[PDB]
Write a protein that binds this ligand. Structure first.
Ligand SMILES: *[C@@H]1O[C@H](CO)[C@@H](O)[C@H](O)[C@H]1NC(C)=O
Ligand SMILES: *[C@@H]1O[C@H](CO)[C@@H](O)[C@H](O)[C@H]1NC(C)=O
Lengths: 319, 323
């Protein structure tokens, strides 16, 4: 067990389990490391032999690993005198999943991450094929090609009417004010894996048509992932990659509830592409305070929120 | 909520923000104490309930009973001073804290104590108190009356967490550890109390597709409805030694006993103790489909085995079981 001391203005000490937030920390405390870059390289040789253009990362740290290891891998690949050039790209927005998966055991090109292409489909990319051995993190090959995120990375906790589902890239908070409902969400990444129900709190009788964070977007199948007058934000501003969902009004905007408002569609931003600000918003059934997203390009509103009088075409949505 | 914690086994410590769950069970000091909001209102509720025709009430948890014992004379004092002739009497608690079919809402009176015929549990009040706020310091806690009736344990006392493939469901008298060795399963369970409420789903992990026949710790014993409450080859231990009240159950053999897996072994029945009423020690045990290390209960009178586990040779009627 983990024995120590923590302070909230109350002080408490003892033994138990401590769940940390590594998302909001400006410092990068964790890095990913391989146990056998040789085995990895061989698995990539096999993958290319098994017909694979490249691989797509599940998380940000995996991508950073692929980046920091690519030269050595290519070097190793050259050390084995096997003709292949490994190319690692960047991650942006939702990390799309790959249907292929690695198996443990002029020049060609192996495309790790990067943007989409016609030469290499997502179905030819490998994904979710690296798990954690132990803790800098000793990683390794997986059992099989499950569409779940790594269990050793997931975490969760609940006490004093505050529930948290946490990850190395996610930080999801719900609370009990009259009822249990989602409160906050923090994202460094957006991934296409599924949140394991082993590390999930309150998973019984969960309507997937109501869970805000999408299941196929590592959304916890939980009644904590619930918010009255909301549904799954399938078409939300997840194209940001890094964002902060909360339940308040965007700065300088006003949202009201009315039947006169339109139907739910792709999330929109307060700021026009031209820079024009809209202050008047509406929802047909949403529950004030409204679902908002804080990111790079500014604030966005939930799918349920549409502008009152302004035409939707004038705005920017999830493309 | 920021702080620093150190793991000896992991040989690693960490600082930062987040959420800390504390094992209130293996605390050397009884840090917590139950205290009401307005004892006068409690007394009022007692008078009203007695007038309704109630005979007594039953605590839900240990520290609740402690509060009752800590405020009874003051309560009985309030009664007389506020014009009424009711004698409130509180006995101790042993084993399972039987629920009461009735409840509180905002000739003598009996609280807890032994089971009696004058005041059956069907006419007892139970699960009528909830916490509003926490005191600080010893650490005390407020209590007020519930506006709703249920058999759920107070949500504000339960906790849960998962990290490093080790789940924990905690309480003030419960501490239930699960882990991932090969597969996910329950590893330990610590009790200072045995209650009959229900462990709510809001504070539960993996509550999907949970066979109550597979949940080791019974649902009606505040057992977490979870696949963290599972064990390969074991079922709901309804006839475990829950008469002990305080116990520490886990998975290892009893000291100087032998358990094996044999289809010839007897079927599952009441949990037996390794030692008989005379004092003999049953060294040979078995199970049909159970898995080793065996489900054992470390209590006061010694080590016990799971329901699936039977004495290999010795007639089970020569052994002591949960009556
Ligand atoms: C809790 O919800 C009520 C309405 O349901 C609201 O009036 C109150 O402000 C909320 N408490 C908060 C936000 O702390
Ligand atoms: C997991 O189970 C195996 C089965 O024999 C055992 O050898 C091992 O020690 C167990 N691991 C832990 C951490 O208890």
């Amino acid at each position: 067990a983990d024995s120590g001391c923590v302070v909230s203005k109350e002080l408490k000490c003892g033994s138990g389990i401590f769940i940390t937030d590594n998302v909001h920390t400006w410092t990068e405390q964790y890095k990913f490391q391989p146990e056998s870059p040789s085995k990895l390289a061989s698995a990539i040789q096999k993958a290319h032999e098994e017909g694979i253009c490249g691989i797509r990362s599940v998380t940000r740290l995996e991508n950073l690993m692929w980046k920091q290891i690519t030269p050595e891998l290519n070097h190793i690949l050259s050390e084995n005198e096997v003709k292949l050039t490994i190319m690692t790209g960047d991650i942006k927005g939702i990390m799309q999943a790959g249907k292929r998966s690695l198996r443990p055991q002029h020049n060609q090109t192996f495309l790790i991450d990067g943007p989409e292409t016609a030469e290499c489909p997502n179905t030819n990319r490998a994904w979710n094929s690296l798990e954690v051995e132990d803790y800098n993190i000793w990683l390794k090959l997986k059992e099989k090609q499950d569409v779940f995120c790594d269990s050793k990375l997931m975490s969760a906790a609940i006490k004093d009417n505050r529930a948290v589902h946490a990850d190395m890239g996610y930080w999801i908070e719900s609370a009990l004010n009259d009822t249990w409902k989602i409160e906050k969400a923090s994202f460094i990444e957006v991934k296409n894996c599924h949140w394991p129900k082993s590390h999930t709190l309150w998973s019984n009788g969960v309507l997937e048509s109501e869970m805000i964070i999408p299941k196929n977007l590592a959304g916890p199948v939980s009644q904590h992932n619930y918010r009255p007058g909301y549904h799954t934000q399938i078409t939300g501003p997840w194209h940001l990659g890094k964002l902060e969902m909360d339940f308040d009004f965007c700065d300088g905007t006003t949202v009201v509830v009315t039947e006169d408002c339109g139907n739910r569609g792709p999330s929109l931003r307060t700021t026009t592409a031209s820079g024009k600000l809209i202050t008047e918003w509406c929802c047909r059934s949403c529950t004030l305070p409204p679902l908002r997203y804080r990111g790079e390009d500014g604030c966005w509103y939930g799918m349920e929120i549409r502008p009152l009088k302004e035409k939707e075409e004038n705005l920017v949505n999830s493309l």
